[PDB]
């Protein structure tokens, strides 16, 4: 299966919410149901309108997405069915092509993604003791070192 990356459309936004939801079910399950619900609502109020980039398969059908502006890839999420297919690299490489000095973040609870992003080449450059709203779910900040 072929992959390309492009800007998202609006109407496919709900598929990106769906992708985020299974990425969370597969690798961030530590997210308590209350926080899951509030994230999913704000995500559904954001991914349909955010200036994202989507990985698409041969059907021009989204299989992952990435948010990058400046040199900061704030978000990267991909359907667990095709994560193993290397789309994780393809989206990071897209981000790197626009930003050679790339940075990103990841929730600390997803130690799997911390490991993955290190394999890809990131190295931790900061953290937070909460996620954002004072919730005790730390965020980590990383820079491409990978090298």
Swiss-Prot record:
Residue ranges annotated for the N-acetyltransferase domain, each copy included: 3-144
InterPro entries: Acyl_CoA_acyltransferase (IPR016181), GNAT_dom (IPR000182)
Enzyme Commission number, as recorded: 2.3.1.-
Signal peptide start and end residues: none
UniProt entry tagged with the keyword Coiled coil: no
Domain of life: Bacteria
CDD domains: NAT_SF (cd04301)
GO-annotated molecular function: protein-lysine-acetyltransferase activity
Reactions accelerated catalytically: L-lysyl-[protein] + acetyl-CoA = N(6)-acetyl-L-lysyl-[protein] + CoA + H(+)
Coiled coil: none
Classification via Gene3D superfamilies: 3.40.630.30
Pfam families, sorted: Acetyltransf_10
NCBIfam families linked: PRK10514.1
Family: Belongs to the acetyltransferase family.
Role of this protein: N-epsilon-lysine acetyltransferase that catalyzes acetylation of a large number of proteins. Binds acetyl-CoA.
The protein's name: Peptidyl-lysine N-acetyltransferase YjaB
Organism: Escherichia coli (strain K12)
Lineage: Bacteria, Pseudomonadati, Pseudomonadota, Gammaproteobacteria, Enterobacterales
